[PDB]
Amino acid sequence: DLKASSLRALKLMHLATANDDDTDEKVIALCHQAKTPVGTTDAIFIYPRFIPIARKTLKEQGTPEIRIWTSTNFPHGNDDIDIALAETRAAIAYGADGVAVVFPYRALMAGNEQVGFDLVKACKEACAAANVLLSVIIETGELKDEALIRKASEISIKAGADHIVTSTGKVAEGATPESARIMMEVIRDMGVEKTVGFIPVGGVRTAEDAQKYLAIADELFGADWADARHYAFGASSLLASLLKALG
Secondary structure (H helix, E strand, O other): OHHHHHHHHHHHEEEOOOOOOOOHHHHHHHHHHOEEOOEEOOEEEOOHHHHHHHHHHHHHOOOOOOEEEEEEOOOOOOOOHHHHHHHHHHHHHHOOOEEEEEOOHHHHHOOOOHHHHHHHHHHHHHHHHOOOEEEEEOOHHHHOOHHHHHHHHHHHHHOOOOEEEOOOOOOOOOOOHHHHHHHHHHHHHHOOOOOOEEEOEOOOOOHHHHHHHHHHHHHHHOOOOOOOOOEOEEEOOOHHHHHHHOO
């Protein structure tokens, strides 16, 4: 049922703007886009400084249950923990519901596994103390190798990632079915499916794409696993297709 999977997809969405979301009016318009005739997306994804205006905007439109995700160490995934941590502490202060931190993937590629663990762990400790979810972007498009994708996913999980996330949306490639499969198998194989969710960013543009991606979660974990806590579409050009499946 493409209609059933489309409504399911919509309700899992972390809605983002398709170009750089760098103004109040882009953010306000994003808030309004997240309230559809058939329901709300689970969240929006914005830069930290826009969280208070977004919160007011969501409240004033009668959808205060739409959550706010933001980004830190983003998009570059540098290996400076102090910076990643300070950005994370600021994101929490602004009022974030979730923080997506970029894993230091270039460090991992150069052979440093420790710094990714330390960086994630530092940020998770701040978020958990404040009741904020920490999601970790590993940048599959830049890692490329299945081995490194698995290793970045592994480290993030051991360091306490609440979700593992394919992409920033800011490089050449976002998620693919292949990178989605690899990351979810890590969750499966480590036995951490209760405590770790998955978030494809990019790669999902049509209703048919969303059904396919949800079918991967369904096959690995059963049809009930992919709720809001465990699954989100990080998507900027998917919502129109979903509403149509339900231009």
